[PDB]
Amino acid sequence: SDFDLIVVGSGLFGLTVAERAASQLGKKVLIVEKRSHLGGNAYSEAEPETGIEIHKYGAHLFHTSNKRVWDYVNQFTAFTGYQHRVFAMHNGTAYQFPMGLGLINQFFGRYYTPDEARELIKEQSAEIDSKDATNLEEKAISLIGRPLYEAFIRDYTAKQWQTDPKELPAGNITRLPVRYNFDNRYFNDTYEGLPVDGYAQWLSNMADHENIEVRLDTDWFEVREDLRAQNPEAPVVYTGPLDRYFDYSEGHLGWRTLDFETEVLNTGDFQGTPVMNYNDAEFPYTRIHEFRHFHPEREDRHPKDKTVIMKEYSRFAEEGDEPYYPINTPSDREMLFKYRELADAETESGKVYFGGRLGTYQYLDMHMAIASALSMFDNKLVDALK
Amino acid sequence: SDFDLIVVGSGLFGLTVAERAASQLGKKVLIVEKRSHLGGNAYSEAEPETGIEIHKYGAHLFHTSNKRVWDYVNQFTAFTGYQHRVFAMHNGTAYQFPMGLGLINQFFGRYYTPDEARELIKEQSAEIDSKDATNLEEKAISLIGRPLYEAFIRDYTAKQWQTDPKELPAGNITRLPVRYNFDNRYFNDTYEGLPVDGYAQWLSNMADHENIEVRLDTDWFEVREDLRAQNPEAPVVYTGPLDRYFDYSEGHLGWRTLDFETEVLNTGDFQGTPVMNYNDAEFPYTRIHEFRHFHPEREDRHPKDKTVIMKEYSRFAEEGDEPYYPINTPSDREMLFKYRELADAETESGKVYFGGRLGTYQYLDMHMAIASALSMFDNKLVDALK
Ligand SMILES: Cc1cc2nc3c(=O)[nH]c(=O)nc-3n(C[C@H](O)[C@H](O)[C@H](O)COP(=O)(O)OP(=O)(O)OC[C@H]3O[C@@H](n4cnc5c(N)ncnc54)[C@H](O)[C@@H]3O)c2cc1C
Ligand SMILES: Cc1cc2nc3c(=O)[nH]c(=O)nc-3n(C[C@H](O)[C@H](O)[C@H](O)COP(=O)(O)OP(=O)(O)OC[C@H]3O[C@@H](n4cnc5c(N)ncnc54)[C@H](O)[C@@H]3O)c2cc1C
Numbered sequence: 195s196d197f198d199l200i201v202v203g204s205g206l207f208g209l210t211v212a213e214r215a216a217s218q219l220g221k222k223v224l225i226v227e228k229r230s231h232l233g234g235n236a237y238s239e240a241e242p243e244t245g246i247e248i249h250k251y252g253a254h255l256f257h258t259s260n261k262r263v264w265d266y267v268n269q270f271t272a273f274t275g276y277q278h279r280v281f282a283m284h285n286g287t288a289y290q291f292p293m294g295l296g297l298i299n300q301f302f303g304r305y306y307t308p309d310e311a312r313e314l315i316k317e318q319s320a321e322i323d324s325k326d327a328t329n330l331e332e333k334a335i336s337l338i339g340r341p342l343y344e345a346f347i348r349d350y351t352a353k354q355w356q357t358d359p360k361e362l363p364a365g366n367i368t369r370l371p372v373r374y375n376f377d378n379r380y381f382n383d384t385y386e387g388l389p390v391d392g393y394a395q396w397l398s399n400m401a402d403h404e405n406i407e408v409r410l411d412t413d414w415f416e417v418r419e420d421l422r423a424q425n426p427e428a429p430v431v432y433t434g435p436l437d438r439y440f441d442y443s444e445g446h447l448g449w450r451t452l453d454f455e456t457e458v459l460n461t462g463d464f465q466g467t468p469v470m471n472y473n474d475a476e477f478p479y480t481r482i483h484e485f486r487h488f489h490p491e492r493e494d495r496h497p498k499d500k501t502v503i504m505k506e507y508s509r510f511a512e513e514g515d516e517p518y519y520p521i522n523t524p525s526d527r528e529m530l531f532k533y534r535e536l537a538d539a540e541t542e543s544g545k546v547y548f549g550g551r552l553g554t555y556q557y558l559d560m561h562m563a564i565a566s567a568l569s570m571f572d573n574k575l576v577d578a579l580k
Numbered sequence: 581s582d583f584d585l586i587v588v589g590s591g592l593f594g595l596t597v598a599e600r601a602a603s604q605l606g607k608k609v610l611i612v613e614k615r616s617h618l619g620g621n622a623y624s625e626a627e628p629e630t631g632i633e634i635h636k637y638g639a640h641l642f643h644t645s646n647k648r649v650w651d652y653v654n655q656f657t658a659f660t661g662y663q664h665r666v667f668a669m670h671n672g673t674a675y676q677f678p679m680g681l682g683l684i685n686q687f688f689g690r691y692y693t694p695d696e697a698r699e700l701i702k703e704q705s706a707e708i709d710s711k712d713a714t715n716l717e718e719k720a721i722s723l724i725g726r727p728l729y730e731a732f733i734r735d736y737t738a739k740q741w742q743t744d745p746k747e748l749p750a751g752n753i754t755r756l757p758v759r760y761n762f763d764n765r766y767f768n769d770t771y772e773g774l775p776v777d778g779y780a781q782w783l784s785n786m787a788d789h790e791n792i793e794v795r796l797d798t799d800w801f802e803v804r805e806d807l808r809a810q811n812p813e814a815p816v817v818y819t820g821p822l823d824r825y826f827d828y829s830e831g832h833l834g835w836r837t838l839d840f841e842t843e844v845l846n847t848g849d850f851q852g853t854p855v856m857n858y859n860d861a862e863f864p865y866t867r868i869h870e871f872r873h874f875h876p877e878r879e880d881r882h883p884k885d886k887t888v889i890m891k892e893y894s895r896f897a898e899e900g901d902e903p904y905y906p907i908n909t910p911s912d913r914e915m916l917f918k919y920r921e922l923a924d925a926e927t928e929s930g931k932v933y934f935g936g937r938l939g940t941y942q943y944l945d946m947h948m949a950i951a952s953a954l955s956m957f958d959n960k961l962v963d964a965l966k
């Protein structure tokens with residue numbers, strides 16, 4: 195047949211499934227993708243004026259402790275030795291971040307040793323016991339105290355969720371957000387880096403296989419009757435929206451979206467670091483990305499006197515908005531449970547498998563989507579394709 | 581014969597020459613080493629109480645942009661992804677270091693953009709033109725201004741050299757010691773890391789070859805008549821002290837030494853970072869090393885409640901002291917020129933080649949010693965061993 199497997203969506207989940215079926219089982223795979231390019235939100239591109247690699251659907255940082263996933267992605271791209279670091283702007287000062295000996299010295303005004311900092315945090319967080327916290331605000335205060343909470347967490351979180359932290363779940367903070375050393379690596383994972391030739395090249399390489407057919411600018415729901423009629427027994431891996439698949443029969447799942455404001459500025463360096471969080475309420479955006487600093491190894495290809503920056507604004511995802519993060523209200527958890535039932539029925543009657551961020555209503559980092567796709571491939575698709 | 585080449589000293593220079601002759605020319609090499617272990621000052625060892633890898637002859641950080649040298653050393657050890665970072669203690673605050681947007685924010689009290697920082701440094705350094713600087717103090721001030729100089733350079737340099745900076749050469753600072761971004765990598769080189777299994781294992785591996793014989797606890801000047809009599813036409817590569825070789829016939833070359841004070845403390849973490857500079861005069865030591873933080877990947881082998889730290893004191897190298905850094909007074913440059921003549925005569929009449937830090941009166945980093953030995957091997961020893 196012309197294809198043995200249909201994959202809807204070319205994010206990391208779709209690409210992984212498609213590539214494994216193609217290379218490991220020698221199956222013909224047809225990828226159907228609604229957008230004009232491969233890669234889902236991980237897709238990046240050159241900003242036209244400067245040539246700098248940028249993202250329109252969120253900056254993407256790769257990191258994992260899963261060696262299987264690390265070895266896998268390295269088949270398709272090399273990675274730079276980029277290590278993500280973030281600074282936090284508060285009351286006109288850029289603080290070392292996350293909270294650690296550096297921020298503590300800057301904020302409290304003198305050097306604390308690791309043991310002195312531990313004792314400081316004990317004193318600061320004395321007021322509320324974590325066991326008694328009834329919301330995010332109280333949870334934070336119970337761990338690090340009011341001064342730190344009020345400076346670095348309160349307004350930032352308010353902007354992030356468009357909600358008073360008093361009305362957010364205590365379960366949103368699960369561990370002490372403080373380090374007792376000067377380590378300011380943002381991530382804690384074994385492996386980390388950025389694709390040497392950019393995300394677009396990496397993701398294109400995943401789908402570059404003699405057994406893979408790619409149809410861009412194609413909506414599954416427009417073409418599905420025709421495609422399946424060509425080969426009815428070919429399974430489908432669906433990574434589009436779960437609720438949309440079932441015509442919103444149980445209602446609309448709730449998502450957060452982001453608005454990105456991009457500017458080309460007439461300086462070669464706007465903030466001297468890839469990401470500056472803006473922790474204060476007076477700034478409407480949560481942070482500014484300056485994209486050239488993600489790839490310092492490219493500095494002589496970057497313009498000397500121009501730079502691209504991006505500001506980020508969060509709000510509720512309405513119709514037409516890209517859905518980014520599941521909101522997960524109890525109502526959302528309710529209809530999700532109902533959609534899972536429908537989906538499972540569809541897998542049994544129609545050989546349609548549901549996966550990925552949109553397909554399962556679950557935020558997934560790149561390595562987690564890949565891991566999830568490797569699992570589905572191993573545990574479901576190998577059998578289904580025999 | 582029992583050997584074809586004698587190498588005096590087993591630092592990186594000696595090891596490199598020995599290994600190349602052994603593996604590339606199939607020559608039998610005899611290494612003669614005065615100390616009880618291989619590796620010269622790069623040698624490291626486990627501190628007995630804690631097991632932590634420490635140095636008795638200075639902490640050794642490996643870094644290079646020389647790809648030939650990088651590829652070479654990786655034949656003998658793997659390297660961790662360690663990236664050196666230093667903090668600077670001044671008036672009770674740990675500053676981000678080297679001077680950059682982080683230190684500038686901490687010191688001047690609010691955030692400066694890259695362009696604002698450039699303008700700040702222009703204003704601060706206006707007083708003295710670099711072209712007019714007559715000593716180190718004036719040179720520093722001409723580049724960064726008095727407040728920064730007085731806080732971070734003056735006393736530190738005084739301790740380092742035991743000299744008023746007014747009496748040090750303007751040529752000691754050759755470039756702007758300020759970055760206009762938040763990059764606090766201490767080194768600027770392409771490749772960097774620490775030996776995964778420690779320096780002792782790496783350096784031992786270099787000399788581990790069927791063609792290499794090692795005699796430790798052996799002073800060249802005690803055994804040389806006997807050894808050369810066994811095979812008169814075998815050349816010698818000498819990496820011991822240049823002036824000592826010629827019985828100080830032209831006087832004693834001047835060196836700086838370091839005293840290291842090591843302590844085991846009853847805490848698992850003393851300062852939360854490998855190195856803290858102490859920039860103020862009130863502290864007699866220049867900096868404190870906390871050795872466990874050089875190898876965080878070993879944290880579950882390190883003790884939970886103990887740590888080894890080391891304080892560093894600089895002074896003139898007297899008899900019995902390990903000579904570390906050439907002082908290079910004009911008098912020193914004088915007799916060095918005379919020793920170079922003697923050495924060159926000795927190479928012609930006696931087939932004794934002079935190399936390495938002690939052998940040439942020149943401080944050499946590990947990668948520079950290796951590069952220098954590779955050159956000597958390529959350009960001198962291949963011919964001499966035919
Ligand atoms: C703003 C943002 C920032 C992120 N930052 C990071 C990060 O820093 N590090 C990290 O590891 N991960 C990050 N991620 C997650 C990352 O994008 C993952 O790769 C993604 O979540 C993987 O899941 P996926 O492949 O299912 O999703 P997607 O990337 O959403 O891919 C789904 C694809 O299905 C297509 N599709 C949808 N409907 C149809 C249809 N009807 N017909 C045909 N095609 C369709 C979509 O166009 C899309 O291309 C971020 C995600 C977002 C949204
Ligand atoms: C305090 C200090 C800190 C340093 N830190 C770094 C760093 O962070 N990063 C870096 O890249 N480099 C560093 N170095 C330099 C590093 O040690 C180099 O490897 C070294 O300078 C290389 O030169 P070498 O092999 O000639 O010297 P050496 O290491 O001095 O080796 C010379 C050897 O010759 C032996 N010897 C001397 N006389 C005799 C004799 N009569 N008979 C037999 N044997 C003899 C000595 O015992 C010694 O083992 C540091 C050096 C010092 C001193």
Ligand code: NA
Nearest residue numbers: 252253254255
């Ligand atoms: Na991201």
Ligand code: NA
Nearest residue numbers: 319322323336
């Ligand atoms: Na508490």
Ligand code: NA
Nearest residue numbers: 638639640641
């Ligand atoms: Na050193």
Ligand code: NA
Nearest residue numbers: 705708709722
């Ligand atoms: Na000046």
